[PDB]
């Protein structure tokens, strides 16, 4: 009996505006499906449908934890045929960015060294911008030798291409001296 | 904006050879880089990525291996090496910053530097 | 991976001839394309990166549109320099492939 394979509605869905379909080749007559689901078998919610008589899946809601390994496997005396896994990619939208140094204030002749972290999917677009003036194009912002009062409201923005929403962080520093 | 890039030229195949990429009118640190070679018969392609400091290395799935990377931001030095030189490994290589990342546009290309093996 | 497949192979055109060139993605890339010119024995420079945002300042007679496989760039006017070998690159991860590229 030939091995299992498998086709999905979309090979990078996105998050929160999405939904997903899978379905298995064999499509045999007289013969029953079931899904493994990371080596569980039918998790029994709203949020996952199996249409077309154990044929179809469908699954709604789709969020940034569905990535998890999906086997349609064909249920016959002697079938015991499973298809290959095959990984989910969830396009999940930016979260909150986190600059690493957290500190609210610096010494003089510090180097700046802000690194911006927002744990998207895809490498999120980053830009710096010092009191409302983009500068970078970067996510790193690094500034060497600083003068005392050269000070300000920094803001990383970060950006999605996927999803197209925004998010920015605002953080206050200053140096006495 | 300059990215003067060097290499050691014309070598056995048998051998291996550094190349490098030097940075001036920018901040080095704060941009990634990359390095595209260029052969009149296959075209444009991807050899190398690097993040700001090391950290995150990617490379080609034609070959896992036998490529190397690394900057040192303090310098403002990009180096590339590799070692068991094939036929197909004669091109022109550019270094190259990034926007955004590694998810952004290929800007401030190098004048590049041709090799041939 | 991802293959980039330029349509137009060469082309020729007069003096302030609308001009576009069109580049298709294998697989899905959203809005990432960049379009990157190339003058004969010099270095590429980087043109509409995120498929809609010139770069640099550049005249605003390239336009660049397209969503999803399919994308195109857009010259309306074409001056007295003759402009070739235009590249269309992804760039949306790892690992990276250009176009083969137009000549004109």
């Known amino acids: 009996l030939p091995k299992p394979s498998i086709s999905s509605n979309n090979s990078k869905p996105v998050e929160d505006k999405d939904a997903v379909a899978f379905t298995c080749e064999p499509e045999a007559q007289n013969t029953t499906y079931l899904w493994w689901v990371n080596g569980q078998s039918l998790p029994v919610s709203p949020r996952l449908q199996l249409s077309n008589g154990n044929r179809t899946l469908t699954l709604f809601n789709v969020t940034r934890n569905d990535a998890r390994a999906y086997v349609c496997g064909i249920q016959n005396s002697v079938s015991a045929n499973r298809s290959d896994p095959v990984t989910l990619d969830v396009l999940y939208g930016p979260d909150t960015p986190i600059i690493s140094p957290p500190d609210s204030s610096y010494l003089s002749g510090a180097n700046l060294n802000l690194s911006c972290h927002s744990a998207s999917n895809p490498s999120p677009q980053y830009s710096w911008r010092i009191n409302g003036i983009p500068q970078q194009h970067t996510q790193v912002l690094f500034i060497a030798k600083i003068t005392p009062n050269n000070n300000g409201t920094y803001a990383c923005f970060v950006s999605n291409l996927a999803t197209g929403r925004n998010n920015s962080i605002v953080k206050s520093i200053t140096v006495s001296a | 904006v300059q990215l003067q890039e060097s290499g050691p030229g014309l070598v056995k195949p048998g051998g291996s050879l550094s190349l490098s990429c030097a940075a001036s009118?920018?901040?080095?640190?704060?941009?990634?880089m990359s390095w595209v070679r260029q052969t009149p018969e296959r075209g444009l392609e991807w050899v190398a990525y690097?993040?700001?400091?090391?950290?995150?290395?990617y490379a080609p799935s034609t070959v896992k291996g036998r490529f190397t990377v690394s900057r040192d931001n303090a310098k403002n030095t990009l180096y590339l090496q590799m070692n068991s030189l094939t036929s197909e490994d004669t091109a022109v290589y550019y270094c190259?910053?990034?926007?955004?990342?590694?998810?952004?546009?290929?800007?401030?290309w190098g004048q590049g530097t041709l090799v041939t093996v | 991976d991802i293959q980039m497949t330029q349509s137009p192979a060469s082309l020729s055109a007069s003096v302030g001839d609308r001009v576009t060139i069109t580049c298709r993605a294998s697989?899905?890339?959203?809005?990432?394309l960049a379009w990157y010119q190339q003058k004969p024995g010099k270095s590429p420079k980087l043109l509409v990166y995120?498929?809609?945002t010139l770069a640099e300042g550049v005249p605003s007679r390239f336009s660049g549109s397209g969503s999803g496989t399919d994308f195109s760039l857009t010259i309306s006017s074409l001056q007295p320099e003759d402009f070739a070998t235009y590249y269309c690159?992804?760039?949306?991860?790892?690992?990276?492939?250009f176009g083969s590229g137009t000549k004109l």
């Open positions: 190259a910053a990034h926007y955004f990342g590694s998810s952004g546009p290929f800007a401030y």
């Open positions: 009118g920018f901040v080095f640190s704060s941009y990634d």
């Open positions: 690097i993040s700001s400091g090391g950290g995150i290395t």
């Open positions: 697989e899905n890339i959203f809005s990432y």
């Open positions: 995120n498929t809609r």
């Open positions: 690159q992804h760039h949306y991860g790892t690992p990276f492939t």
